[PDB]
């Protein structure tokens with residue numbers, strides 16, 4: 001499922017920004 | 021009558037933007053209790069004002085590290101914005117000061133935690149719960165966009181829940197006060213609008229794109245574009261191929277379809293009726309916009325709170341000692357702070 005696909009990405013925790 | 025409020029809110033903000041505030045406090049006036057948050061150049065602490073016994077969140081920036089990571093202009097801009105803004109979903113700055121080592125910003129403690137912990141714990145919010153939050157964000161943006169501010173950093177990690185169960189926005193690190201366009205690659209991958217990824221030269225429409233990602237993420241439990249790596253998320257974003265779970269109402273799909281619109285010139289919030297296209301949308305038909313502004317609506321979720329200075333809705337972080345140096349550091353770079 002989509003839920004399971006989301007867990008498989010490893011981005012279920014706090015997400016950082018990118019800078020320059 | 022909303023346009024008069026904004027014109028009066030605009031003149032208020034412009035005065036406080038040109039004639040602001042400096043060294044309104046000192047560090048030994050506060051007892052440091054616990055770390056509520058970390059980050060690359062700083063930490064946020066629950067402090068207790070000893071004089072009064074009131075609790076605040078204190079943000080502590082290391083001056084040397086801010087210089088290292090080329091963030092001078094961002095930290096200065098956050099402070100400036102925070103003392104000039106006034107709106108019930110934007111956190112209040114009580115004191116700012118600095119010493120040899122550190123910049124300090126003292127704000128109101130918001131004890132309910134990040135929306136993020138709440139949403140991962142419950143899994144998803146029902147459509148009305150999700151709508152309650154959305155509506156608060158729609159007014160905040162209307163406020164900031166009239167001031168010419170673009171926010172750029174919307175995600176559940178950056179929305180806190182107060183005692184009444186309403187939202188407070190902190191983090192103006194990336195907000196930029198401009199009329200016209202801007203070009204910086206900045207933000208968080210899942211929430212970057214396509215024009216940002218394609219290096220196009222972009223505007224406040226990015227914020228409404230972000231509101232769609234947030235509404236989707238709130239009602240689904242997960243963002244609409246993910247993958248192992250930033251790059252492969254960006255590929256999904258520019259394609260504009262949203263799939264919606266089956267439990268989404270058709271009214272939500274329709275709005276989401278109008279916010280996650282790849283093309284700038286048909287995206288809701290960027291058309292001629294402006295923010296009114298989002299507020300008159302059918303998904304928000306039951307929504308009393310004034311009553312939301314006045315905080316007169318029973319929140320559908322209220323976080324647990326056991327007394328003043330309770331940190332139970334925040335993570336545990338590793339406590340470090342406050343290093344204050346005997347030598348002044350980076351005095352020229354931070355004169356305006």
Ligand SMILES: O=S(=O)(c1cccc2cnccc12)N1CCCNCC1
Pocket residue numbers: 056057058059064077079111127128129130131134177178179180190191
């Ligand atoms: O929770 S915080 O530490 C925080 C910041 C500013 C004011 C706050 C007031 N009360 C609680 C937490 C606060 N925060 C910084 C870490 C990144 N997540 C967004 C907010």
